[PDB]
Amino acid sequence: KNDWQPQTKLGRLVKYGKISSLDEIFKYSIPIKEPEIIDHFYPKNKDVQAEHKLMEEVLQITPVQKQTQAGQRTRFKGFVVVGDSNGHIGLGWKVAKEVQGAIKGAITHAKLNMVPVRKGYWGNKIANAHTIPQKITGKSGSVRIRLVPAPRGTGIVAAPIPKKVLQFAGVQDIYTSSQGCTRTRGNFLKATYYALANTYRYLTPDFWGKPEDNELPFETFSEFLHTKA
Amino acid sequence: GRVRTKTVKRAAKSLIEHYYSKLTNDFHFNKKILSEVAQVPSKRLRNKIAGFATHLMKRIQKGPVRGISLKVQEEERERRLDYVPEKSIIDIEKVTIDNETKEMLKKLGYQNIPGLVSA
RNA sequence: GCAUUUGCCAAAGAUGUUUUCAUUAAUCAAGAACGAAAGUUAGGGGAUCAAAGACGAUCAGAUACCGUCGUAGUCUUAACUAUAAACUAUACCGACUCGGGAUCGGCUGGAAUAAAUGUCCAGUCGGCACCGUAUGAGAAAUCAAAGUCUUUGGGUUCUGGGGGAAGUAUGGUACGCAAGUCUGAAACUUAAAGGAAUUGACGGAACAGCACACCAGAAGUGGAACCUGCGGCUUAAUUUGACUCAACACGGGGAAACUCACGAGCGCAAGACAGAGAAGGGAUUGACAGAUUGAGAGCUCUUUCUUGAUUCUUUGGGUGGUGGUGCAUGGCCGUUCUUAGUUGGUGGAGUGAUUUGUCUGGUUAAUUCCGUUAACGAACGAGACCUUAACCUGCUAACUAGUCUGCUUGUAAAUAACAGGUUGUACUUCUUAGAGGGACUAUUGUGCAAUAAGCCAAUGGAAGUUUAAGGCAAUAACAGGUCUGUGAUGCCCCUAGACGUGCUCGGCCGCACGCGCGUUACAAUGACUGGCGCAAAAAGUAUUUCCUGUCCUGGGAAGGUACGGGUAAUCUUAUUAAUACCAGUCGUGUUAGGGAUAGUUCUUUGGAAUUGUGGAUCUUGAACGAGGAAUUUCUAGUAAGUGCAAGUCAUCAGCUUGCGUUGAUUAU
RNA sequence: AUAGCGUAUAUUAAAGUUGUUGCAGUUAAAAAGCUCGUAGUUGAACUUCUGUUCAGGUUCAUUUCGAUUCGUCGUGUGAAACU
Ligand SMILES: [Mg+2]
Ligand SMILES: [Mg+2]
Ligand SMILES: [Mg+2]
Ligand SMILES: [Mg+2]
Ligand SMILES: [Mg+2]
Ligand SMILES: [Mg+2]
Ligand SMILES: [Mg+2]
Ligand SMILES: [Mg+2]
Ligand SMILES: [Mg+2]
Ligand SMILES: [Mg+2]
Ligand SMILES: [Mg+2]
Ligand SMILES: [Mg+2]
Ligand SMILES: [Mg+2]
Ligand SMILES: [Mg+2]
Ligand SMILES: [Mg+2]
Ligand SMILES: [Mg+2]
Ligand SMILES: [Mg+2]
Ligand SMILES: [Mg+2]
Ligand SMILES: [Mg+2]
Ligand SMILES: [Mg+2]
Ligand SMILES: [Mg+2]
Ligand SMILES: [Mg+2]
Ligand SMILES: [Mg+2]
Ligand SMILES: [Mg+2]
Ligand SMILES: [Mg+2]
Ligand SMILES: [Mg+2]
Ligand SMILES: [Mg+2]
Ligand SMILES: [Mg+2]
């Protein structure tokens, strides 16, 4: 059973090669619950040179304890980052009693959590947006992270963890600032992620004009969906 | 201790669900019906299922039953429930308005629409 | 901090202003006014309580909680003192960000009446709050501020910078009569101390389940003799494991030898395999006979004759070990517990550990179901499953079951009755036991259930307590038990007068006592003497050995071996049990109740019975007159009584595991 | 790491753990028991707004164009904030 049968309307729309690009899903803000939709846009034919290669990384694995009916019952938590270096990043975490299990479930989670980082210009606008449009802030638990845009080739100035996240996002050049208890790795990761996410939340002056008015994919593709397969 | 279990009630639901047109108030009929219709590994089991399903036939004869949705019988029951007289209650040409309703109609200006009787 | 009436004195907010002034304001080192209680000084006052104190009680000790007293205090004038968890632990002035009723004080309209210092309604200003809610905040608890904070700046005082040291030392032309207040260190030492919240565990908190836990009862143990385990105590040795359920008639643990580990005294090697030496001109084995010994153990000693590498001496080293270690371990097994519990996926909630699911409530033996439902569906466990028991005058058949039919035989007047023997293209009620039925809580119920799960009753039914009684037993544990069940083992120990393998005699059974299972009784619902065609379930011969049927002998337990059957639905046997019943004796007293303990005889199993293996006959006849504090198990063919088998086993049941017979009281 | 490399001590970043930028003070250390108040710090709104015309650049845009060239220049025209 290596063939994917979509349980989501969006899932159908994706598998059958109807919705064009991933970012489009992001645009119409269609919830992705199915961790297939994502592997779709990232083909496993394995051409080594694409920067659109989708990357997975285990970050954390934690032995979590419970006190239950006189026993001490351990599970594992894990954190996972997924990203193509080009614009797209997700973070996920899962608890399970078997390690490789926690890992798989967390990969799946992270995929469901995919988010569109926005890339801006520091100084004069020439070629590759190497950084963020504004300064922004992640907040998780106690922790805070501030992302400030840096000039060309500054590189990522940031702790090992948020650095890893940012590299997955494909921010080349950045300045970091962190508050809170940062050694809480899940909160640090979370913060960096949410921060990276807020890039598109910020209304910058270039976003000021009237947007395009389009119909949702579902309204256009309504005919397709109501055929019975 | 005669409380009946999960397996049995799921079973009975299913058996009625698909077969209601075939089923009788008689246990001895329904048990044979079940036997033909299904794979039941035990005599005892089948009989428990048949008994409960019979019980539920009787409960269905009386009215609506939670957990079982017989769409055919429910649509028949729905057509049953409609009865319409020719006059309705709703008379467009004669309608009665409170004092306060009248005040709001004054506000909109509709106080004088044809066929409006104040009370 | 302020709560009785009235009068007086000055003061205050809010509201109401088409009044006046016109920045006069905000906050605040100096400096000042207050400031609970307790305490201090000088007078008063003194009823209540009441530090100190005096006593009672409690307690191991109480200089405490409790009780009887009682001083200072408590109250009051003048004065000091300045401190509290002086608490919203939350600085003041100012903006701005949600919703909703209500409340206290003004005012503004409106409405009703019994027409007012009263009601109601709608506004609004100011107070004290509350209830929702935040796509605001926070580590959270929580917060309409604790919001408008890395998108960080409205104004202003104060305070903090890990924990202790320590509010200590010291200095105060700072205070105080004093107590003390205010100011206030460092050395030194230390990795944590600390905050919220989660899950457990626990509670001398609240609530709710369930179980013979208790309730209504019964049989009783605990009291007695004896039996059999533990512990003590003797012992050469009294082998040993196992101590609350979850050790202690448990280790199949009923031991005369054996078993067997303990004890005393003796014998063997089954010390392989390798290296060195020795050996064929001899390694080594054996053994008459005399001593010797418990012993025809050639064990030893004298005595030589055999025997012919099966190897001997060392040096290494393996076999073997009921020797240690269950806290090195496997396996198995107890126990929580047969209780009803335990998970995960996808959705919901938390930054998170985690949570919901898995629940208020009914209902069930059951997280069994119904229903509630941010949860939806599922898995394990329970159920189902499986075994035994209960129903079939219907099926399939039976000489290794029975019935009938027809013949006969005996006793009899016998197509009577009761018994045998035969019989058949016979038959299935009884008996085997295969197939298939059957029960599902069925039918009914203006019975209780919020009409849902379910419970209840009556009827039918072989069967309606989950039909009954069982087997199986999740997740997790408990360093539970087991090296002594294992040729499952790690590690440790013993290795030739061995902790190896044998033989002989003891020992585990030894008795002032303590503690457990139990058998038997204390009698009249009884004991004893007769009579009486009532069971079930188990077993059974490697041929004489195993069940045993006739028969004979003996007064008896038991012996013959005379005739026989059975490896068994055929034979023991479809019997042989005992309570029970019917007669008769005995007559409420240590009586024949009760028989412990003893002495002769006889028999049986075993080489061996002494330290009585069991059984038989005469004697002998104890405690015990219904059991203190305590406490066990148990709801129907059930308890209780009553015998029978099987395991053990040559012999030995007061034990165990089962089997029926007679059959309850009381709950449900 | 490397002809260098350990160690001790003061000091710098790490430290938004001294904080003007920039911290905390309901419960983690932290709002003074409470008012008055001088120094100090802090302070409501109003006054030549505005419009019209000229020029100079400086920027901007580009359906104005041009010239040449590897990009500046000239020019439009309007559009700005200026001066
Ligand atoms: Mg930091
Ligand atoms: Mg005085
Ligand atoms: Mg005393
Ligand atoms: Mg007194
Ligand atoms: Mg009025
Ligand atoms: Mg804060
Ligand atoms: Mg939040
Ligand atoms: Mg609130
Ligand atoms: Mg600030
Ligand atoms: Mg013994
Ligand atoms: Mg060995
Ligand atoms: Mg031995
Ligand atoms: Mg889950
Ligand atoms: Mg989840
Ligand atoms: Mg979440
Ligand atoms: Mg729970
Ligand atoms: Mg319940
Ligand atoms: Mg469910
Ligand atoms: Mg059962
Ligand atoms: Mg132990
Ligand atoms: Mg004989
Ligand atoms: Mg017999
Ligand atoms: Mg004798
Ligand atoms: Mg005797
Ligand atoms: Mg025997
Ligand atoms: Mg025994
Ligand atoms: Mg504290
Ligand atoms: Mg000004």
DSSP secondary structure of B49-117: HHHHHHHHHHHHHHS--TT---HHHHHHHHHHH----SS-S--SSSEEE-HHHHHHHHHHT-TT-SSEE
CA distances B111 to A89, B91, B118, Å, are 63, 18, 10
**Documented resolution in Å:** 3.7
> CA of A180 and C1' of C195: distance in angstroms?
15
CA of B111 to the centre of ligand 10 (A): 114
> CA of B1 and C1' of C218: distance in angstroms?
28
Q: Footprint of strand D, using CB within 7 A? A: A 178-179
Query: How far apart are the C-alpha atoms of A219 and A225, rounded to whole Å?
Result: 10
- Nearest nucleotide by C1' from B56 CA? C452
Q: Which helix (H) or strand (E) holds A177?
A: strand A174-179
> CA of B18 and C1' of C445: distance in angstroms?
32
- Nearest nucleotide by C1' from A64 CA? C353
Query: How far apart are the C-alpha atoms of A163 and A95, rounded to whole Å?
Result: 24
D chain positions with any atom within 7 Å of a protein CB: 15-16
CA nearest to A35, candidates A86, A116, A104, A117: A104
Q: Residue A37: exposed, middle, or buried by beta-carbon count in 10 A (0-12, 13-18, 19+)? A: buried
Task: Identify whether the C-beta of residue A159 lies closer than 8 Å to the C-beta of residue A176.
Answer: yes
Query: How far apart are the C-alpha atoms of A192 and B89, rounded to whole Å?
Result: 65
Structure token pair of residue B29? 């009929």
> CA of B20 and C1' of C210: distance in angstroms?
41
CA of A97 to the centre of ligand 3 (A): 61
C chain positions with any atom within 7 Å of a protein CB: 138-140, 150-151, 199-201, 341-347, 351-355, 363-366, 368-371, 382-386, 437-443, 452-455, 465-466, 475-477
Exposure string for A160-196, b = 16+ CB within 10 A, e = fewer: ebbbbbbbbbbbbbbbbebebebeeebbbbbbbbbbb
CA of A177 to the centre of ligand 9 (A): 17
Q: Which helix (H) or strand (E) holds A24?
A: helix A22-28
What SS3 class is residue A86?
coil
Query: How far apart are the C-alpha atoms of A89 and A84, rounded to whole Å?
Result: 7
> CA of B8 and C1' of C266: distance in angstroms?
80
CA of B68 to the centre of ligand 6 (A): 56
Q: How many residues does chain A have?
A: 229
